[PDB]
Amino acid sequence: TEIEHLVQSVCKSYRETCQLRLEDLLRQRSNIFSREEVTGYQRKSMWEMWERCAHHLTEAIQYVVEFAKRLSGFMELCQNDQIVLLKAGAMEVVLVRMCRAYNADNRTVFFEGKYGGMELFRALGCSELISSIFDFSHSLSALHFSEDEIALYTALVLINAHRPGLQEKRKVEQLQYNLELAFHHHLCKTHRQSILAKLPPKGKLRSLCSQHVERLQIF
Numbered sequence: 001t002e003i004e005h006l007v008q009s010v011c012k013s014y015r016e017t018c019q020l021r022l023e024d025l026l027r028q029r030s031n032i033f034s035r036e037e038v039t040g041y042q043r044k045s046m047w048e049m050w051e052r053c054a055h056h057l058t059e060a061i062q063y064v065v066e067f068a069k070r071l072s073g074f075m076e077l078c079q080n081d082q083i084v085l086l087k088a089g090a091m092e093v094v095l096v097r098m099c100r101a102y103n104a105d106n107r108t109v110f111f112e113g114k115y116g117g118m119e120l121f122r123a124l125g126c127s128e129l130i131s132s133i134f135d136f137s138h139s140l141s142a143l144h145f146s147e148d149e150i151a152l153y154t155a156l157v158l159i160n161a162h163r164p165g166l167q168e169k170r171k172v173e174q175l176q177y178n179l180e181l182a183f184h185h186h187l188c189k190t191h192r193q194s195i196l197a198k199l200p201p202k203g204k205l206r207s208l209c210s211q212h213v214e215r216l217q218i219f
């Protein structure tokens, strides 16, 4: 039950640090882009559309940093390892967090006040990647994660002791192990263990968050 106090702690850090309130996202599912707004976005140059998207992604990252800061043990890690973990994991967490912005019923995603499909992002240069991002959100949305589960899962996406560059490896390993124990305890308690087998495989998140995203300093 130190474990259950950890579960509650991680869930509160997550709830305090969302960019978007879940209930606002659900409210807005009826609010969908017209054929003309989609065309208005398809018409934008590659540059301006990346500028747009890289801005949103940088704000989304700041919310993940604030998640890390409010997370138990994280802030007692040495500064080098805080930076290593966030550099390695922050994009991944944003990707995982976007499934709450995704509506599996019509395959739309929340974007700049309204919901739209993947053809919204045509001006970007990368239909393969967009498709892959959508397919992944579609799969992650199928778990119907509780708020607890997604808080713990994203905690673990972040506190990963296999990140090249950590000095105090062991101290991150204990933090990871305690988060793992919290997660498996909570899943066992609610008979949700089965979802473990449906989580993304080792290296799936990495492969989404490398293709095309990095060196965005240019926007």
Ligand SMILES: CNC(=O)c1ccc(Cl)c(-c2ccc3c(c2)CCCN3C(=O)c2c(F)cccc2Cl)c1
Residues within 6 Å of the ligand: 019, 053, 056, 057, 060, 094, 095, 098, 109, 110, 111, 112, 113, 121, 124, 129, 133, 208, 209, 212, 213
């Ligand atoms: C009012 N606020 C917003 O609308 C808002 C807030 C937060 C965010 Cl994160 C977004 C947003 C940002 C980027 C993207 C999407 C939504 C949906 C698809 C394109 N995309 C990506 O996921 C992105 C990625 F993660 C990997 C590779 C390529 C890309 Cl472009 C929009």
